[PDB]
Design a protein around this ligand. Structure first.
Ligand SMILES: *[C@@H]1O[C@H](CO)[C@@H](O[C@@H]2O[C@H](CO)[C@@H](O)[C@H](O)[C@H]2NC(C)=O)[C@H](O)[C@H]1NC(C)=O
Ligand SMILES: [Ca+2]
Ligand SMILES: [Ca+2]
Length: 275
């Protein structure tokens, strides 16, 4: 395993957002041309094993551990919606609560990490969170105006390309794609840049404050708005389905307060140069 490896994301110009928004309330529109300097992106979501190295080094206690609870999806039991439950003792080591464990899933994405927990990790690692624009550029994997990192078909060539939901959400996840919950961080094909699970599996924090008001002005290395209350997260998770939550597109976007944590939310890091 080299689950902390980074790939070089080449300098370029891309179309961020879409003029065919699918969730208009989320400010997916308008399409806008953004210039991104070359930088490095983690190939993988940060795994349980990688996060454990950080905690071993620093003694870091996550926000969920200090609060004493975190949000768990009801379908994973042995609020934003009725299927989200605040569970006492749910945290990154205990992803469904105090009687769950990560011992059998060391290579799965770390979960129940807040935006602050993510920043702590990335900075410990000699890295940082990506901006939303960096994240989206990276997600798109060198293709223009596609739905997904790989193109516009959900199952190209009849193959599963990401870990999302199949079946009737929230009652039945068929596990058709091979995973009901998370998958290992190196599961599924990489995109054109070498990135794995950038849509699906775990949601991914970015550095930007959330807004839905964007100009069509062309920008260079944008950082998002200077203030806000929620931070931007991207990419969707193992829970997403076309029927209720169509957010496994590069252009999709959502938000949470920075001290928030949940059983479907993780992150990956970026860097200006190799650490
Ligand atoms: C984090 O630290 C723990 C505790 O030191 C490590 O687990 C130990 O690893 C040693 C060396 O391989 C074993 O001999 C012990 O039996 C382990 N102790 C326990 C209680 O698990 C762990 O490997 C470290 N984690 C990472 C990812 O580096
Ligand atoms: Ca799945
Ligand atoms: Ca992901």
């Amino acid at each position: 395993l080299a689950h902390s490896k980074m790939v070089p994301i080449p300098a370029g110009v891309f179309t961020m957002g879409t003029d065919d928004p699918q969730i208009k309330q989320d400010g997916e529109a308008p399409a806008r041309r953004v210039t991104i300097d070359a930088f490095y992106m983690d190939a993988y979501e940060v795994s349980n094993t990688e996060f454990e190295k950080f905690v071993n080094s620093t003694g870091y206690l996550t926000e969920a551990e200090k609060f004493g609870d975190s949000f768990v999806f009801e379908g994973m039991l042995s609020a934003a919606a009725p299927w989200w439950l605040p569970v006492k003792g749910a945290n990154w080591r205990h992803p469904e609560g105090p009687d769950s464990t990560i011992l059998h899933r060391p290579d799965h994405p770390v979960l129940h990490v807040s935006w602050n927990d993510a920043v702590a990790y990335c900075t410990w690692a000699g890295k940082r969170l990506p901006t939303e624009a960096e994240w989206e550029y990276s997600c798109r994997g060198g293709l223009h105006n596609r739905l997904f990192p790989w193109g516009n078909k959900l199952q190209p060539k009849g193959q599963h390309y990401a870990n999302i939901w199949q079946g009737e959400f929230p009652v039945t996840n068929t596990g058709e794609d091979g995973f009901q919950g998370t998958a290992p961080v190196d599961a599924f094909p990489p995109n054109g840049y070498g990135l794995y699970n950038i849509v699906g599996n775990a949601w991914e924090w970015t550095s930007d404050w959330w807004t839905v008001h964007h100009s069509v002005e062309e920008t260079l290395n944008p950082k998002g708005p200077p203030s806000g209350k929620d931070r931007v997260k991207k990419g969707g998770s193992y829970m997403c389905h076309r029927s209720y939550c169509y957010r496994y597109r590069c252009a999709a976007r959502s938000q949470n307060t920075p001290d928030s944590s949940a059983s479907n939310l993780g992150f990956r890091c970026a860097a200006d140069r190799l650490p």
